[PDB]
Design a protein around this nucleic acid. Sequence first.
DNA 1: CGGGATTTCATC
RNA 2: GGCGCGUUUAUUCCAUUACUUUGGAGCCAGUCCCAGCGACUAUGUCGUAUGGACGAAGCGCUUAUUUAUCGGCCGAUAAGUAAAACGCAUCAAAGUCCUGCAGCAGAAAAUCAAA
DNA 3: TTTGATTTTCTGCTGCAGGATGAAATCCCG
Length: 952
Amino acid sequence: IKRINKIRRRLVKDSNTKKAGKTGPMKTLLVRVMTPDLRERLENLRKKPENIPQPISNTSRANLNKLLTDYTEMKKAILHVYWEEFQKDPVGLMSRVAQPAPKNIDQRKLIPVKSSGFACSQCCQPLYVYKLEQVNDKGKPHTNYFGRCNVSEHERLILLSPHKTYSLGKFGQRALDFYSIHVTRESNHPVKPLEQIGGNSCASGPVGKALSDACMGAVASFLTKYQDIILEHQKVIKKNEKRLANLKDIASANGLAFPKITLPPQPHTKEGIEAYNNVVAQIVIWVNLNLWQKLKIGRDEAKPLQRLKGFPSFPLVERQANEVDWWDMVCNVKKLINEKKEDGKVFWQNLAGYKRQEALLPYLSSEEDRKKGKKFARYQFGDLLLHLEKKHGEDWGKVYDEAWERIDKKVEGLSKHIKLEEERRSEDAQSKAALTDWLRAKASFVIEGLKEADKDEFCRCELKLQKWYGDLRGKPFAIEAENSILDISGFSKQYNCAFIWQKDGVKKLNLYLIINYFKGGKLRFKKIKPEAFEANRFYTVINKKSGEIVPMEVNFNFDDPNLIILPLAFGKRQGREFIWNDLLSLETGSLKLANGRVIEKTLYNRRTRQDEPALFVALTFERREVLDSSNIKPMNLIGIARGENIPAVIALTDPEGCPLSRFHILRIGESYKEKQRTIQAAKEVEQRRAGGYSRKYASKAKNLADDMVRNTARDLLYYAVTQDAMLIFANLSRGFGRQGKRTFMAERQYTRMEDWLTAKLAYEGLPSKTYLSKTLAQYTSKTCSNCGFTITSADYDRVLEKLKKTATGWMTTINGKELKVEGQITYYNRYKRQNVVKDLSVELDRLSEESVNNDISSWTKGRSGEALSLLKKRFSHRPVQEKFVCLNCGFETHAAEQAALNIARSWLFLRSQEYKKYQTNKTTGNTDKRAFVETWQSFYRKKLKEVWKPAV
DNA sequence: CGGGATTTCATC
RNA sequence: GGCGCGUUUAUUCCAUUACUUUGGAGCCAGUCCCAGCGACUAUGUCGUAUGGACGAAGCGCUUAUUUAUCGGCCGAUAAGUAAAACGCAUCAAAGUCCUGCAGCAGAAAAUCAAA
DNA sequence: TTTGATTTTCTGCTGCAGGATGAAATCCCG
């Protein structure tokens, strides 16, 4: 059958196994700790078993909770202190936390800097730079840089990176010796969480050696982010200089007096970031007000200034908690609107004749916003004002009052609903967002009364209300639940934690987990002989740096008021993988338990119908013996064709490009798109009935898509294994994916399918390249198999130029092929939001009615571009995302199967001596892709003539 | 003078 | 989608240890009860079960409490209450986790000194 | 998105960093 575990069994039997290197492929077993509610669930089976194991003792729970609280508080205190230090001195901190090179390089330094880049915070002295040229694995010389000082105490190996003027390049979690500062009593630093928070009731060693990493990792990450952003800030400022200069030139071309507001330079505080971003936003608003719409100048003509993004915030401390409070900001908005209500009332009541229509231009929605079931608050506010104007005439004095009454009623109702929801147990972010939109529209309309009288006051009010609107939209999802972690830096005797089993019979084992992190607790680890096992006793093993295993015996008391005892709860497959695996067992050392965690996160309990915290044990198992890249030989190929109606059509072929029948065409996940469409229809119905859907449809589409992806991946892997085959994908940059107007991150699955197969082959120890491959996606999906011709836009330009009218009508040719200029093309106009069908010949006649003799090249370049767009939309080789049409010969068959075969044939093409000759020609400085296109077309035609006979 | 830690130092 | 239920997800031995999910299948989706949308015939009604709250989600086999058709209390046939040997719809899959920041995937409003 | 012209709009939750541990010298203890 098709089981992933049978595939893994064959893979294990397919080749020899060898022990893992310095670090093995990490894998986490996430089990759940036996709890009283777990036992309650277990007791209610129809076929009740003989023995129900005991739950976890209450003392263990209390001790674990106290330990988690202490660890969290210690981490918070340490990060707070180091945030204060950073807020005092950035340079010294980021110089200290720089990760030194390993204290093992005894290579002789040869070339110092031909100097004053940074300074060691210990001596505040400049760090000399030294280079070192060596020979790498593949023959490319590499240049490294290191920092050493005149002080023997400061003779470290701080990393330096070149630029074209130097940077650190590394930030570690163990560079700064955290132990000697806040734990040991000899140091007199005023911060000592162990002596202060825990009251000398917690063990020093393990807790400190965990806190060190648990804080310095985050510190190093933030320092890396900031030290990387510091250079891009300067470069972005430099680019903005030229962009502003060009914009000023364009503005002065029309004789426009540019406002005297200048760009703040690259700052190093977030206040400067905010000021520069506000200046940029105001400049963009002014340009949109005066140039984009007034002059009908498009966006290509205006390269704008850039806002500042990418400046990080300090971990766990600069995470804003929104202390300004939601209701306080709402009341501030109310007060500001009430103060500025008179200004808007006077402006609208005392409006001129024709100025009334232009005053309401932003308030009225166009077809684009109206057709999509719902409009922004500004649009509906304008429509309500239009209704009031229709109902009560031009009496805007009372119209404003009635509109204020309606908006105030809606605001009060929304506020009451929000308070009622948020008081007891619930929260309504949708209502908050709607109320915020209403308040924003009301504030805009109210303060629009000062658009031409008091410019600065109006702008200040606008900025304040906009930032208040942003804060009111952002604050509600601040969350209240955070994970709690309890690290175990390693599994050795010192750390006083171990995994134990009961030697029942020959192989059966009971499972207990013991935590010893308190002073006064008793836990004895006794070394024993290899086969001294006895019943009612716990036994375990230990790992060693030299590859030795030294099993030991555990003895303790179940009523100890200090230690923590954990019974587990898991399933057969998990036990066969980690706990009681048959082939790779922890006794031999093939499977190793390196580190674990006591993660406590909220999970849904169906018995209580609620989400409650549930202790997990993220036992990270490092597979110490993996497969060897010694017996693997791809051969057969499985060309995967992507699409929507058919999730995947796969074509089999040999390593001669000759397809063979062993199943030849297989389709997996049929009608699943119909289920996706049904789910989408239900969601759209729920939106039409309220504007949103519930949590039942939260991930139905996502879950179905992921299930389809994983099932298809399993099927592909089984086919590859059973046929000794390989899979063909494309070479796409990281982050590849389509983003239209309604795209979701879950459709970036081609790369994610590659990644899933990569991870699955990676836990077994082999890279993705063994059975997963990529094709150079240059013109791969743009080729047909009947003519060997790949369409380019130069041919489109030639077709546009050649377009003329003969006795039978318009005529144009591609590669000498006469094309009947006839037929109708359908387009989806966003202004109409419907289907409009136009005739190519009729539109050409209409466009040429302004010219003589139908010479398109004699028209304006805009008319030629429009004719080019018409010809391209008529002669597009990809009319639909799921349809391909051959422009040259139009051989007729099932398109998807032919495309599936052609994908594999293209991947085969992406290795040839023709490509070698193309590379040699490209070494002549002719960096043109047209040579590649010609070579690929010629090679494909030659191969079609020789062995790749098209369908007969 | 070993139990028995106990911490402290240290380190890809 | 709401409720339940277990199956298989290991080649001779490694829990029929249950966890975290998705499917197949079995049953059930009504109550403006409160609040978002159109007409707004105006802050009034209707509808679109939308967001939450509210019930909602098998059958028989084996063992005792609810009766006499029979002779001067014996079982004749069956209810549900319980246990549980239990049989059917009911049969299939996969898992590698943490901390921090917030950010990365676009295109249609879009033409000029339009190279 | 895939040949030359481009950039403020409305959508939605993942994309980049940091990783997954034994000697040494002491101490409480006489």
